[PDB]
Amino acid sequence: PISPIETVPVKLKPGMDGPKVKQWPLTEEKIKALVEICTEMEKEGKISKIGPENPYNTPVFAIVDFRELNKRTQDFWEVQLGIPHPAGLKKKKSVTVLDVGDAYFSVPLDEDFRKYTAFTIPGIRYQYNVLPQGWKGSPAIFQSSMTKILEPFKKQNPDIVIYQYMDDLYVGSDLEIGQHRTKIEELRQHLLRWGLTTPDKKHQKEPPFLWMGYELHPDKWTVQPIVLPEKDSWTVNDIQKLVGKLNWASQIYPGIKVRQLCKLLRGTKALTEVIPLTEEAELELAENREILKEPVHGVYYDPSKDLIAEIQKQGQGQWTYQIYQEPFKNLKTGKYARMRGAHTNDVKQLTEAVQKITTESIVIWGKTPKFKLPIQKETWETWWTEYWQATWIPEWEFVNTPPLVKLWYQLEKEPIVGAETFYVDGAANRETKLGKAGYVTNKGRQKVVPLTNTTNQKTELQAIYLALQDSGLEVNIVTDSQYALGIIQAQPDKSESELVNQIIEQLIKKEKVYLAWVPAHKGIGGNEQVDKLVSA
Amino acid sequence: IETVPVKLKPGMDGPKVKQWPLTEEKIKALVEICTEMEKEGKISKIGPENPYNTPVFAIKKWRKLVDFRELNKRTQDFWEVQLGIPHPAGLKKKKSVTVLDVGDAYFSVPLDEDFRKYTAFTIPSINNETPGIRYQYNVLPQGWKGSPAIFQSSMTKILEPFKKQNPDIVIYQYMDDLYVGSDLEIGQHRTKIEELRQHLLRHPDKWTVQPIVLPEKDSWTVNDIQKLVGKLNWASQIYPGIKVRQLCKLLRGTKALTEVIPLTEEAELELAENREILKEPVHGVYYDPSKDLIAEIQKQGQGQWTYQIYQEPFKNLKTGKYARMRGAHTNDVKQLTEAVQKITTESIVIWGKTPKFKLPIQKETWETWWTEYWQATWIPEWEFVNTPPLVKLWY
Ligand SMILES: [Mg+2]
């Protein structure tokens, strides 16, 4: 049933010409099979025999390697921000999921591009007439076709809601199971007048409809845990499709990216060849599994009840949040591990988590949720005022949860009277990567320290550290370095930098600190002194 | 009419920008705005096979706003058909400039067919429950660089009468705007605008720079001097004559920061002498028409902000301070935005170009709210950054 829809005009990437690849001769058996097969696609109209003139060719195997053709195909414009989240679905009275079958083979390929789709049978020579299976266009062209076709039936049935996602048509409508049945009939026939045949093996009873792998019960959508095999013959394409499953779940299941397995795909070869990988490969699947094991689910959406996001600092650099509408009936829960900076703050990370969640909703629900955050209104207010950059949170609202967020410490706006003033400085020879770090003081103390394999930044920090250690609860300290000044000025909660962490531990312990800065090399008092002490 | 052929800059392809998520509201808004333009035939639905895309959004003074910044960077410069011919220079000086939205004119002139693909834009769908609606302009689009220059002549013929009719009212066209400046009294100004307005229907002189000044002290502690010293050090990069030395001399020791210190004639001479030069023009300032303008904004906490426009570092073409006292309307984002918008209009009226901004904010943040406050027909280029101690260095 090849659809009568107009064809989307496809081009090759400018500067390129269609593929030309040799077919590795297959086994007598394989060949006799591919023919057997090709002959009926030829019968169904899906493909067709062609003369040995057509320069181009792409490999068939018997278990089409479209890699090349795709590498030279006009990259299209995928028209979707992402896959739809089940929580985004509103609750409907009547719902059916028509799996449009064979949908690719039904939708015809542009004539003037068909040339490129030729393939031979070790030979017999064919060329497609319809969206090929592996071809790059297929999905994007199929979606465009599917929509042009639904449009008509849609202007006609505003009550009905059709969501497409590949070969699956979620048709929902708040209707009498009777009248719905009828609409589904009608619809089912429209498709037919367009060659789109919808098999009888559909959804006809079961409340757990599987639209996109989301079991759609009337009040609870769920996702059956994704099984992820590990066969003997771990074939290339298998490795690719494997990626798919993972990647698909990923928009629910938190982090799974088999990125290092993906590296195995960064050195492609025959699609039929088997090719494993080290601990990278082996271990990646496992960590993925762990996550894939525990199922997920949530309620549907109400376009009349508020969205509420609630985040909680469930640990160092990992946060959690849930977006719900009804106390124990949440849509999406989520974890958010991140630390955007080498030195961040909980206040700072909270904000990041907020903004993630904000858009994430705007994508799914279409509006920004209202928050319940582990941070006191005055703690925020002080922090933004004490920060050089501009910031902002939306529907902020305090919720006294157990782990709370606070600015662990703060520096003094003005120098402490009666605090031993530490003049600090460090240095290191670029060549040797060795340096000293020390100080001098208004009293008389004067430390200096030998150092191995560091940078001048590291010394300038070591030096602040020392003066912090060798001092009391209140201390004025002074650097010839904006680097260290900056890190500290930013009130870093934690860091990748141990020394910075060290420097922080002290900072939370002291009682009053005032870090100041002076122009290096000017005869600024005390400075010229520590300057000489660290020089060799 | 026969379309003016325009083409992308050498060896650059059209734009291919992803669309930002839109609120179930701005979307709806757009959706109707487009369905009409479609009916009027100014746009037209296109397919997935047009690999290009520019983002759109709903500003609201609803208005469709296409973020053409890319297609503009990729558009051939205009210089044959001299885009907005010489910059007035008069504008800078007039008693009153007023800006008009000549933009809707553009929707008449037909756009070169072999160029339409490059304006493709896509209206997003909630939860991605629907393929986006994609379109392609069929007329000079609103924010395109190509538009105005192409329509340059039509406009010129249109104003010529009224211009020769009032030989001294400067009219500068920039993008979709018309900066009509005059020195007439406010009332007698407005008439001229209205006269100019029928035709189409067919206060810089107060701007002021920032004089850097050192504090007024007596309670000079050690760091009070250390402070001064540090600044005057950096200030030299701007005024090579300023020099701290007699000041550093006061500091010589290992004095506790709190120690008070006697400002001797050594320094008394230097401060006063320096105070002079901080108000004397850096003769090196030059606005070079071939260099970009850069704007830097610092946050000053009191709902105040500081900015400097410069082409080459330390050669400030202008410096300033916006203080948007928002007792309740304190959305830094909203402020910073308003800052941004007020600084680019100043530059359009002066250098005749929108500076490229270095925003003191996180991309993410700036990216999630900016549109909520943006009110302009245009959108300057911007780069996110982290301001160092300049806050102090000039406030
Ligand atoms: Mg140093």
UniProtKB/Swiss-Prot annotation, chain A:
Consequence of substituting residue 99 to S: 5- to 12-fold decrease in affinity for dTTP substrates. Strongly decreased RNA-directed DNA polymerase activity. Slightly decreased DNA-directed DNA polymerase activity. No effect on RNase H activity
Outcome after substituting residue 392 to L: No effect on RT p66/p51 heterodimerization
Site residues (Cleavage), renumbered to this chain: 422-423
Effect in UniProt of substituting residue 422 to V: Slight delays in replication. Virions contain primarily p51 RT
Stated consequence of mutating residue 138 to G: Complete loss of polymerase activity. No loss of RNase H activity
Documented effect of changing residue 165 to F: 70% loss of polymerase activity. No loss of polymerase activity
Domain Reverse transcriptase: 44-216
Outcome (variant: residue 207 to A): No effect on RNA-dependent DNA polymerase activity. No effect on RNA 5'-end and 3'-end cleavages
Effect seen on changing residue 285 to S: 59% loss of polymerase activity. 8% loss of RNase H activity
Effect of residue 281 to L: 68% loss of polymerase activity. 10% loss of RNase H activity
Effect of residue 169 to A: 76% loss of DNA-directed DNA polymerase activity. 60% loss of RNA-directed DNA polymerase activity
Outcome of substituting residue 171 to A: 37% increase of DNA-directed DNA polymerase activity. No loss of RNA-directed DNA polymerase activity
Result after altering residue 214 to A: Complete loss of RNA-dependent DNA polymerase activity. Complete loss of RNA 5'-end and 3'-end cleavages
Domain of life of the source: Viruses
Other noteworthy facts: Error-prone enzyme that lacks a proof-reading function. High mutations rate is a direct consequence of this characteristic. RT also displays frequent template switching leading to high recombination rate. Recombination mostly occurs between homologous regions of the two copackaged RNA genomes. If these two RNA molecules derive from different viral strains, reverse transcription will give rise to highly recombinated proviral DNAs.
Protein name (database record): Reverse transcriptase/ribonuclease H
Organism: Human immunodeficiency virus type 1 group M subtype B (isolate BH10) (HIV-1)
